[PDB]
């Protein structure tokens, strides 16, 4: 994979959808805003001032926290706190569920 250094700027939690921004000579990361398309997924807790890395790779699927109950095949978007939630507005869809998840459980997703 291709790794690079990035700094959290707002208490990154594991399995949350992440977004990024241009900071002080470094890419800064945080939980993705509600109702959008995320760029990266957390797989480690990284606090507000903590420095970490990002492992680049065209992953087939992500495992993220379900922000609500999810049915197999549901199109997903970002929700509160960077969780993944069911939707129907194409422009905010970043992937879809291949398995059932209850709120708070991990849900595997396939990118689109």
């Amino acid at each position: 994979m291709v790794s690079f250094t990035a700094r959290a700027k707002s208490n990154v939690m594991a399995y949350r959808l992440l977004a990024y921004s241009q900071g002080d000579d470094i890419i800064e990361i945080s939980h993705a805003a509600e109702n959008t398309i995320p760029d990266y997924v957390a797989v480690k807790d990284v606090d507000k001032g903590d420095l970490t890395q990002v492992n680049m790779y065209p992953l087939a699927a992500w495992q993220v926290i379900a922000g609500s109950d999810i049915k197999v095949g549901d199109n997903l978007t970002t929700g509160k706190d960077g969780t993944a939630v069911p939707t129907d507005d194409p422009s905010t869809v970043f992937g879809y569920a291949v398995e059932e998840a209850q709120e708070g459980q991990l849900v595997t997703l396939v990118i689109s």
């Binding site: 594991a14 399995y15 926290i65 059932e100 998840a101 595997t108």
Partner: protein, 50 residues
């Protein structure tokens, strides 16, 4: 009566993953839906639905 969880004891690396299997003791012949959940005092670390 009893929900039984596969690999009740696990040692998992920080980049990895472990499969967990639910086993339901249903008296009636009904396929009851199992909700997976993870609790732990640090952050991240979620389970998929299956």
């Amino acid at each position: 009566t009893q929900v039984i969880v596969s690999p009740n004891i696990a040692a998992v690396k920080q980049g990895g993953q472990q499969q967990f299997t639910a086993y339901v003791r249903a008296t009636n012949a009904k396929d009851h839906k199992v909700v997976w959940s993870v609790e732990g005092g640090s952050t991240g670390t979620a389970i998929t639905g299956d």
